[PDB]
Structure formats: structure tokens, C-alpha cells
RNA sequence: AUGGUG
RNA sequence: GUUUGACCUCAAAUCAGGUAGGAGUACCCGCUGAACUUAAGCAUAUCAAUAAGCGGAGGAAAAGAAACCAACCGGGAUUGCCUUAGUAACGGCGAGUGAAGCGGCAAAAGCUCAAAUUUGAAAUCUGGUACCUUCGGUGCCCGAGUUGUAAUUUGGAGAGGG
């Protein structure tokens, strides 16, 4: 058989939008080896990992219809990535052109640069199995489809993927704006293993200008 | 917080058995560039829309000669759409 | 469309007779209701104080008089609002027991 | 069609002497009627007005009533009866007694128990506390209800019917 | 808090209402898999993992309760 | 008192007991016109609870509505009898085909509902036809009408908040 | 385009 | 007991008492809903959640006593006005589209139901009828009504007793 087998269970809050469901079409399609549930604190989800019997979790906010916070892991131990989204290109735009056969598992770009500090190693790790279409996930068709790539731009740090036209390739996303928030012990447990101070959350930049 | 240690021993618990295979499963090289490099203005899209281009350019290169290699290959079907 | 106020002449005087007349029955009595002193929320305007709607339960009770009674006296009560700050409250009691010691009752 | 447990409880009523005795009874409970009130009323609106109650009696009627003094518990014997137009009504009262240890008797027809209450209809009517007269043949009455209804009845309970 | 008058009422009511098929496919495949497909096919039905404890615990606790 | 046996059993609605009555009382009712009156409630709880009475004055008709709705079941009636202010309705049965829903009403000429000032208000003018203006319980839901975010359409009207919301007015010293 | 008279 | 009667359901009446339709439709509440055109004659948007159409009232209507706003030393039903503001946000990030709380001020108002037994008493109500002081009252008789009329209570609590 294979030796790289995942599930990835996706979840995300209450108070959707279409930049939350435009996102929850892509990736729900994006991962052939992916189970799709209902929306929904923090305890139960690696325990829904245990009802669907899932190994890959991860989880999307929603607060005032603007933080998007994707919690990351692989459940029950994790451990986790509290993540933050801004400006996010999906894969519905005008000047994202493509159109991707389904369920392929693409090749990862992405830069050394995340080895010089472990935790990018971490957030690799995790997203290695949690976004990688392990060969071939059922429901998938073989050879290669798409390029998706990760990296870092003042620790603000891009994935995307391109649509290959035999090598010329041109983006189909979706192009996505990463940040690490917060690292957790386990899988949605524990004392806050790892923070970048880089972030300031949007509600604190408020609670910023109230003070003038 | 800002914790090494407990970020090493999940660097042990997470990682999957990479070491342990060929390179057929997830597909993930690390390049070369930092691509921190030649981004003159942070503000700037293309500039490393330029330099990822690139990089997935190079990236699928080179992955075309671990794929001719490992004989099963990129280029989408283009006999089948489904 | 274009609306146009041409009668924020007249309209002002309209107002001055109604409350002429409103105070052409109810004439002792000051067309209007005690109302408590309020602290504004929002960190910008938090430091200035206000006019809010009706006084409370409680600083209706500790006043000396109850709510039903109150109404019918001039006082005007919001049952909905919860008293924290000390001082707050003591301002509106204070301003109470003045209301008290200030007004008349006719008899039956 | 086949019909749930909970129901064809109905359709298992008293016979016609048990039911006949019941009635033998109540028949002297009838509560007072509407010109009757009027009258010793005005009797005594005259007496009072120119020139010693013990309490009265009579069977408690009122469905929501009638419940109400169930599960306090007051009564000693329901009549229940086969036919409401919203049947829903009374699906509860036989298993509530039931757990109540309560003697429910299902007796037939609306009009039959209405018209003991001086009313057009009831579909339940019950008492609990009797005078001391028949107290007797209230005791054996519920005896009697236990004895039929109740004992080889059981088997109600399961048993889809139609 | 809740009187216990309605947890009567309610523990009454439910005994004498018949379960609906749902209620029997739970307790069925409770009787024979569990609570794996249990939690499974209930959520699946039912809105969430807050909603399948309801049901499903409701559901264990009956049979240990038709003894 | 019975009612919190009714609705706790009501709760209840594929249950067996209410299965069977269902699929029975439907079978009647699919046997009659389209208006059909009822002078009892099938449940008596959301009877009390929407505010029937019974007494002399209250009106209860049944209509089966086709495959919004329960607007439509108001309207209907609504036609039908026209000296009968409605008041409220809600849902009984469903056939396949059909939602039975059955409604409730208020005569206004009747002397003895035009005391009682519970349920005097409602003889006054501005209450003729309430269904084809959208005031009841479900009228006011598809309005979009409550309090909150949740709704900024319209806590007054989709009309009247976009009609005055873009439309320029001026004061006379301007501003 | 809307709604109407032939 | 093959009669007799009660209840249900459903009829019918040139019986009494009522009531609805049409007119107007400035305004207001709903449902339906285009094109000119703008934007490149564009698939979006726009024009517009408009106009013509259909349904329904009033002197106003509609909304209304938080399943609200908030995030602070907290305001406290609605509606309206100055203001937040052309701000946040939406933008082939294009035409352009576009808010809300806070703040000032006008006017200010609160409440009904259902959910516990009146059980030592349906205490309620329509109508008829006679008289009277008649936008009604009282006596009488039916009828509704116990599958619930009246009283008590609406979480701001409340109830029973003392």
C-alpha cells in the first residue's frame, strides 16, 4: 500500500460568509482524503476526531464577521496552530483562471528558510500532512495537477497554488496570507507554547485608536 | 512561550516517517532561495510574485526530473477532464 | 426627491404650543420627570455624565418610596438598569430625597 | 391499522354492571345544578336579610382540575372517558394514575359522565373524598375496579391493537 | 434549576409517547455496535457533538433504565 | 393543570401515538373542502397559548394549503370571511401534498368580544385584514422584523429605511 | 420595457 | 329495550341580529417586478431591491417595552432630527456603492397573555322578555361555557399564611 495515510476533518465557526464558504469550497475540494461536517467550545473537536475517526484536524473563527483564526492539529496530541488570515485570494477570482481535474495531490514549493527556526519546521510538519494529498487518497485521479507553495514575507507567509500548463504554470490558489499566532501543547490543550509578539489583533489595533 | 524545548520534542512527536522513505508521498522540496532576498519593497506583489514564480517554477522542474525519475509524472492528462 | 425643511419656523412654533397647552391641564404639576445622572460608557466618552432614563429599583427603595408610587409622584423608574458605581448611586438618591423634600402632594 | 399500546386502553371499558354501579353512586353526587344554587341562595338572602354549614359535597370534575388533584395526590376514583374530540387529551391520565397508584376507571361515553355534572359533556370525572355513607361502597367500589379492570388488564399495556 | 414536577413530567411523557425510529435505530445499533456509529449516524442526524450527548447518553441511560 | 403534559408530550411530534393520529386525522380532513371550520382545536395547547379563548365570538377554520405558506393559509380565510378580523394560526398536519394549517379568529361585530378589554382592541379599524399587511406572528417574520444586528434591514420598514436613507435633504442656512 | 384598446 | 333518550357530526330555513365587497389611494404595510440608460452596447452591478400591476387601512400608518447594544467608571422600548461619514466595509479595489453603537436634541409610558385548584360551590358572558335613569341598568329564561368563562400572577417576579 502506502506509507503517508491522512484525514482531515474541516470545521469551521458559526457566522460564515462568502470569503468563509468561497474558502470552505476550495479547501474542502482541495483534500480528496478530507471528511466535510457541520459547523460549530474547545474541547470536542479531537473527539469528533475520535467519532469520524480522523487524523488530521483543523478549524476556522469566526469573530465580528473578521478574525479568521485557523486552529491547527493532529488530534488528540497535536499540537496546535492558532493561525490568523488576511487578505485572502481564493480560488473564485476573475484573474484566477484555472480549472484543476479533482483530488490531485500537488507538489509543495516552499522555503528553507522555516528549518532556521523550529517552530516554521512545526507549522511545515503539520501542514506536510495535513494539506498533503497522501498517494494516492481515494477519489483521486494519478500523475500531477497543481503546484502549491508556502514561504515567509516578514513572517507573514504566503501559500499558493498554479495550475501547470506542461514547465509554464499560472495560480490557482487559493493565495493565502499566513501568520503563526500561537502554539498549544497538544491538540486544542495546554499552556501557550509559542508566541510571535509580530501580531496585533485587530480588535487590540481598536482597542488601540479608541484611546486616540 | 517562545519555547524550544517542548518545540523540539513535538518536532520528534509530529514528524512523519520522512526519514524513513522515498520522496513519493507528500511531495515538499525545500529550495534554495530564502526568497527574503531580491524583495526590495515588502510592498511590492510582483516582485516576489516574480520570485515564487520562480520558485515553483524551478521547484517543478527539478521535481519533473524526480518524476520522470519515480516514473509517475506532472503533466495533467490532457486526453481526460473529469 | 430633494426634501427641503421649510417650516423649522413653523415647526418650532407648534412645538412651543403643544407643550403650552400640555401645560394648560397638567399645570402645576412640571410637564416633565425626575431623572437620574448617568455615566456614559465607550472609554472616549466615559468621563462625561448624563441624563439617563428612570432610576432603579433599588435607588427608588433606599430613597424612602417604592416604584409604583413613584411613577404617580413624577418620578420616572427604568427597571432594566443595574446601579454599580457608589457614586452614581448616591448622586441619584441624593437627587431623590431633594425631589422629595422639594415637591407638594394636593390631597383627594 | 394497528394502533399504539398507549391506545386501545380505550376501547377496554366497564362492563354494563360495574359501570351501572358505578353510577349507582355518583347518581347521588350529581353537583348541585345552576337554579339550585339560586335557590338556596335566595333562601337564604331572605333569611339573612330579616331573620351551621357543613361542607358540601359533590364529584371534582374539571379536567385540568381533575389532574390537579392527581399527583398531589387527592382523588380516589377517576372516570375517564373513550370518546374526546382531540383524543389527545386523556392519553396521559391511565398512565399517570398508574404510577400514581391511582384507581382510573374508564367508563364509556362523554355524554354519559356529562351528564351526571349537570354539563353537556366531561370525559373526566372524579372524586376523592366521599361522605362517610358510602364509603363503604366506595371502598369496595375501587375494589371492584382494581378486580376488573385492573387485574387481567395488564396485558393492555403491550399489544398493539386493530 | 427545574422542579421535579416536569423531570417527573418529562421522564413520564417519554415512556408513554413511543419512540420515534430514531430513538430505535440508536438503541438498536447501541444494542449491537455502540456508541460509534451511534455518535456517528445521530450527529449525522441531529445537529452536533453538543447535540449527539443528548440523544445518545439519553439513550444508555435507557436501556440501563428498561432493567 | 394538564398543559405541561400536553405540549411536554407535544415536544413529541414522530412519536408513535402522535404517528398513528397523524396519519388517521389527516385522512379526514383531506375528505373536506379546502375551508374547513372546526369549532373545537385540534390541540387545545396552542389554542390557550396563541391566545384562543374558548367562548362565544372565536372562530376556527382549517385550511389546506397546496406544496409563503402559512402567509397563504392566512390569506385564504382571510377572503373567505371577511367580517372576521383574523388573529393568529399555526400548524396541525401535513399531508404529502398539502400543510394543513388551521387559524384562528375574532368576530368584531360580536357584542360579546367588544367588551372585554383584553381582547377589545382588536374591533378598532386599523386592524381590518391584518394578513395582506403582514402584522402576525409569522408575518412579521418574513418582514425580517425584531430587535438586533441581526436585522438593520428594517426595525421599521425595507421601504422606509432605503427611501429616507438615500435620499438628500436640506435645512434652510444650509449644513 | 409596463400595462392596456382593436 | 324492535321502543325511548341523550351526546357527536352535518345539513337546512324568505327566522332574528349583524356584518364584507365598491370610491380614493399624496402618505404608509406587503407581494410581484422590467427596460432606456450608466458602467464598453458587459455575462455582475447599475438604473432599482424603482416605475406600471395586485392586496390592505388610517388621520396617520408602520415600529415598540430587548432572546438590545456593549466591552467601558456601561447605557436600557420605539420613531424622528444634527452627528458619527462619504468612516468601516464593498469595490473588472472599476464606474463607484456604502452603514451602526456611542454624543447632542425633540416626545417620553407603560404593559397584557399561557405556565400552580374556586373547589367551601362558574363566582363569567350573548340573547330574549318586563320595566327603568337607555351609547346602559335590573328581574326573569334559555344558551354558551368545566375540551375552562371570572378572580390572582407576567422573572421588574410571585403565591399561602403569620
Redesign the pocket.
Given at each position: 500500500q502506502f506509507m503517508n495515510k491522512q484525514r482531515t476533518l474541516l470545521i469551521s465557526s458559526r457566522g460564515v460568509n462568502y470569503?468563509h464558504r468561497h474558502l470552505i469550497q476550495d479547501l474542502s475540494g482541495l483534500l480528496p482524503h478530507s471528511r466535510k461536517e457541520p459547523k460549530l467550545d474547545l474541547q470536542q473537536l479531537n473527539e469528533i476526531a475520535e467519532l469520524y475517526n480522523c487524523n488530521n484536524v483543523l478549524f476556522f473563527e469566526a469573530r465580528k464577521h473578521?478574525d479568521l483564526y485557523l486552529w491547527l492539529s493532529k488530534p488528540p496530541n497535536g499540537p496546535t496552530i492558532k493561525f490568523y488570515i488576511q487578505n485572502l485570494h481564493t480560488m473564485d477570482?476573475?484573474?484566477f483562471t484555472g480549472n484543476c481535474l479533482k483530488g490531485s495531490r500537488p507538489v509543495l514549493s516552499f522555503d528553507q528558510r522555516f528549518e532556521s527556526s523550529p517552530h516554521y519546521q512545526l507549522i511545515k510538519e503539520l501542514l506536510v500532512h495535513n494539506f498533503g494529498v497522501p498517494p494516492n487518497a481515494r477519489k483521486s485521479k494519478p500523475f500531477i495537477d497543481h503546484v502549491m507553495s508556502f514561504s515567509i514575507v516578514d513572517d507573514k507567509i504566503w501559500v499558493r497554488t498554479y495550475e501547470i500548463s506542461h514547465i509554464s504554470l499560472v495560480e490557482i490558489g487559493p493565495r493565502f496570507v499566513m501568520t503563526v499566532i500561537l502554539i498549544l501543547e497538544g491538540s486544542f490543550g495546554g499552556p501557550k507554547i509559542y508566541e510571535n509578539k509580530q501580531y496585533v489583533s485587530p480588535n487590540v489595533v481598536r482597542?488601540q485608536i479608541?484611546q486616540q | 512561550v517562545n519555547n524550544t524545548k517542548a518545540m523540539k520534542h513535538a518536532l520528534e512527536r509530529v514528524q512523519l516517517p520522512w526519514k524513513k522513505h522515498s520522496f513519493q508521498e507528500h511531495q515538499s522540496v525545500t529550495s534554495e532561495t530564502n526568497t527574503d532576498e531580491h524583495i526590495k519593497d515588502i510592498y511590492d506583489d510582483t516582485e516576489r510574485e516574480l520570485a515564487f514564480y520562480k520558485q515553483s517554477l524551478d521547484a517543478v522542474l527539478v521535481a519533473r526530473d524526480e518524476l520522470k525519475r519515480l516514473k509517475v509524472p506532472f503533466k495533467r492528462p490532457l486526453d481526460y477532464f473529469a | 426627491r430633494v426634501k427641503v425643511h421649510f417650516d423649522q419656523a413653523g415647526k418650532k412654533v407648534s412645538?412651543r404650543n403643544?407643550?403650552a397647552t400640555?401645560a394648560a391641564k397638567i399645570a402645576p404639576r412640571p410637564?416633565?420627570?425626575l431623572?437620574?445622572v448617568?455615566?456614559?460608557?465607550?472609554?472616549?466618552?466615559?468621563?462625561?455624565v448624563?441624563?439617563?432614563?428612570?432610576f432603579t429599583?433599588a435607588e427608588v427603595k433606599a430613597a424612602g418610596l417604592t416604584?409604583?408610587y413613584a411613577?404617580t409622584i413624577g418620578i420616572?423608574?427604568?427597571?432594566?438598569?443595574?446601579?454599580?458605581?457608589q457614586?452614581?448611586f448616591d448622586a441619584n438618591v441624593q437627587r431623590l430625597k431633594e425631589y422629595q423634600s422639594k415637591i407638594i402632594v394636593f390631597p383627594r | 391499522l394497528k394502533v399504539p399500546p398507549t391506545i386501545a386502553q380505550f376501547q377496554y371499558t366497564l362492563d354494563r354492571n360495574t359501570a351501572a354501579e358505578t353510577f349507582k353512586l355518583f347518581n347521588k353526587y350529581r353537583?348541585?345544578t345552576?337554579?339550585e344554587?339560586?335557590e338556596?341562595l335566595?333562601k337564604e338572602a331572605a333569611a339573612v336579610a330579616e331573620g351551621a354549614?357543613?361542607?358540601?359535597?359533590?364529584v371534582?370534575?374539571?379536567?385540568?382540575?381533575?389532574?390537579?388533584?392527581i399527583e398531589?395526590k387527592?382523588a380516589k376514583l377517576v372516570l375517564i372517558?373513550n370518546?374526546?374530540?382531540?383524543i389527545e387529551?386523556v392519553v396521559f391520565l391511565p398512565a399517570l394514575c398508574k404510577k400514581m397508584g391511582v384507581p382510573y376507571a374508564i367508563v364509556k361515553?362523554?355524554?354519559?359522565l356529562?351528564?351526571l355534572?349537570?354539563?353537556?359533556?366531561?370525559?373526566?370525572a372524579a372524586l376523592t373524598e366521599v361522605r362517610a355513607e358510602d364509603e363503604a361502597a366506595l371502598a369496595k367500589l375501587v375494589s371492584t375496579i382494581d378486580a376488573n379492570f385492573a387485574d387481567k388488564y395488564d396485558e393492555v399495556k403491550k399489544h398493539w391493537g386493530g | 434549576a427545574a422542579?421535579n414536577?416536569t423531570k417527573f413530567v418529562r421522564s413520564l411523557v417519554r415512556e408513554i409517547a413511543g419512540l420515534s425510529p430514531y430513538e430505535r435505530r440508536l438503541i438498536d445499533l447501541i444494542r449491537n455496535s455502540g456508541e460509534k456509529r451511534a455518535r456517528k449516524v445521530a450527529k449525522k442526524r441531529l445537529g452536533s457533538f453538543t447535540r449527539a450527548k443528548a440523544k445518545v447518553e439519553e439513550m444508555n441511560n435507557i436501556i440501563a433504565a428498561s432493567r | 393543570?394538564?398543559?405541561?403534559y400536553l405540549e411536554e408530550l407535544q415536544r413529541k411530534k414522530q412519536s408513535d401515538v402522535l404517528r398513528f393520529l397523524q396519519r388517521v386525522r389527516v385522512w379526514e380532513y383531506r375528505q373536506?373542502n379546502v375551508i374547513?371550520?372546526?369549532?373545537?382545536?385540534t390541540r387545545?395547547?396552542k389554542?390557550?397559548?396563541l391566545?384562543?379563548?374558548?367562548?362565544?365570538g372565536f372562530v376556527i377554520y382549517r385550511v389546506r394549503v397546496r406544496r409563503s405558506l402559512r402567509?397563504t393559509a392566512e390569506?385564504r380565510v382571510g377572503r373567505r370571511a371577511?367580517?372576521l378580523r383574523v388573529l393568529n394560526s399555526y400548524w396541525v398536519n401535513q399531508d404529502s401534498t398539502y400543510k394543513y394549517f388551521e387559524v384562528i379568529l375574532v368576530?368584531?361585530?360580536?357584542?360579546?368580544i367588544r367588551?372585554?378589554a383584553?381582547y377589545n382592541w382588536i374591533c378598532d379599524?386599523?386592524?381590518?385584514?391584518?394578513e395582506?399587511?403582514?402584522?402576525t406572528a409569522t408575518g412579521?417574520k418574513?418582514?425580517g422584523?425584531?430587535?438586533?444586528?441581526?436585522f438593520?434591514?428594517?426595525?421599521?420598514?425595507?421601504?422606509?429605511?432605503?427611501?429616507?436613507?438615500?435620499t438628500?435633504?436640506l435645512?434652510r442656512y444650509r449644513?
Open positions: 470569503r473578521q477570482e476573475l484573474n482597542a479608541k | - | 412645538r403643544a407643550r400640555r410637564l416633565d420627570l431623572r437620574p448617568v455615566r456614559a460608557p465607550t472609554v472616549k466618552y466615559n468621563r462625561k448624563r441624563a439617563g432614563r428612570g429599583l416604584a409604583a411613577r420616572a423608574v427604568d427597571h432594566r438598569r443595574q446601579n454599580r458605581n457614586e452614581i | 353537583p348541585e345552576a337554579a344554587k339560586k338556596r335566595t354549614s357543613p361542607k358540601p359535597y359533590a371534582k370534575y374539571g379536567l385540568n382540575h381533575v389532574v390537579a388533584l398531589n387527592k372517558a370518546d374526546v374530540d382531540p387529551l361515553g362523554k355524554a354519559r356529562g351528564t355534572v349537570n354539563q353537556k359533556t366531561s370525559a373526566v | 422542579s414536577r | 393543570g394538564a398543559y405541561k373536506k374547513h371550520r372546526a369549532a373545537r382545536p387545545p395547547d389554542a390557550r397559548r391566545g384562543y379563548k374558548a367562548k362565544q402567509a390569506e371577511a367580517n368576530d368584531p361585530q360580536h357584542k360579546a367588551r372585554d383584553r379599524p386599523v386592524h381590518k385584514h391584518r395582506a399587511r403582514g402584522l412579521k418574513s418582514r422584523i425584531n430587535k438586533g444586528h441581526k438593520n434591514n428594517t426595525k421599521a420598514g425595507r421601504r422606509k429605511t432605503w427611501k429616507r436613507q438615500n438628500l435633504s435645512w449644513k
